[PDB]
Design a protein around this nucleic acid. Sequence first.
RNA 1: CGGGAGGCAGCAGUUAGGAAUCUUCCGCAAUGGGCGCAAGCCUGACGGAGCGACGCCGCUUGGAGGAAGAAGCCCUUCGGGGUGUAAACUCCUGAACCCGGGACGAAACCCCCGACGAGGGGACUGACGGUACCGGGGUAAUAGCGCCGGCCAACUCCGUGCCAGCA
Lengths: 145, 83
Amino acid sequence: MKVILLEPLENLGDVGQVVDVKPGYARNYLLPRGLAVLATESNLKALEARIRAQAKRLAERKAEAERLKEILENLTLTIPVRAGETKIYGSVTAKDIAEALSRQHGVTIDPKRLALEKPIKELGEYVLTYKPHPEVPIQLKVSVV
Amino acid sequence: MVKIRLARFGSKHNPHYRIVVTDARRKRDGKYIEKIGYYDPRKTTPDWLKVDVERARYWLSVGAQPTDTARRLLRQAGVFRQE
RNA sequence: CGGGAGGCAGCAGUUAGGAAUCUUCCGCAAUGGGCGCAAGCCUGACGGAGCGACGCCGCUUGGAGGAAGAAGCCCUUCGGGGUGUAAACUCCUGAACCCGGGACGAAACCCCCGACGAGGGGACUGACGGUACCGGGGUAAUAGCGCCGGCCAACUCCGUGCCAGCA
């Protein structure tokens, strides 16, 4: 008796799994408790259709992390802080780094998917990273004026 | 001039005022002349407002401006009302 | 080259000193203040957020079984004794995270009836914040410091030899 799963369980689990059981088991537990459905081709083909959708649909927003790595991974920022020497008077949070970058080139960024703890407050040279999954570290230059 | 208005008490995120008569030049929560009521603007009780209406009448009778947001509340306990 | 400019013991910040003491943040929505008949304008006061076990309070790193008692290490009268139900292992609960929904604080000023009054009715407005909190799903998931001669609660082995050290 071929059936497709939902909630994973013991000795038969992961959703989409297609497994054979004894009809009694199917008819009096799984199907009624809603822990499976019949392996009809009716459903069996609509399962492949759920995968072929979600699976490749998700590699759109993986190829879209690279459609934005291939542009900022190299490009430089340069930030005009009013400092004195090595130390700065104010700081430089993301609300600026994400911001400046947007109006310096036209690029929107989440100030949250960065890679920053403390807000710099220190003149020099850095390159922090970005997110999600496989990543893009953006390149930034502090300054004076 | 001399006034009727609200002075914070309570805690953070727990507003809790006392209706009170005072010189305007005082600091918000400073020394006041006299207490006449209290008021919980979260109404977390059957008593979320009280007023010695008797007295409220006195201070008005001898010249005293209440705040906008104070006036509301003395009206709402019928101090102005004349039958 | 005749003369000019400045006074953070206001908010935040730099420097110096020192054992040592924070953000160049958000908002006038709430309260309070100034001017204005009013609409409203200003308010680093205030209402909030950020940083620090600095303190007080609450909460977690698991619950129930489980050997006449694994190994490892320590003692030993070499029979054993100790860590110790502790662990392994078995079920059962489900901090974090995940998806959804999401405030109270805000009813006045102002507009209509009455009279711009007493009284009645009607509308705008939330920085914190998609944050608390509610509902569904959901992984066994940080421990360290001080002391064990008497005062003073907790003893045995080795090392050391008025040295090294403790107080």
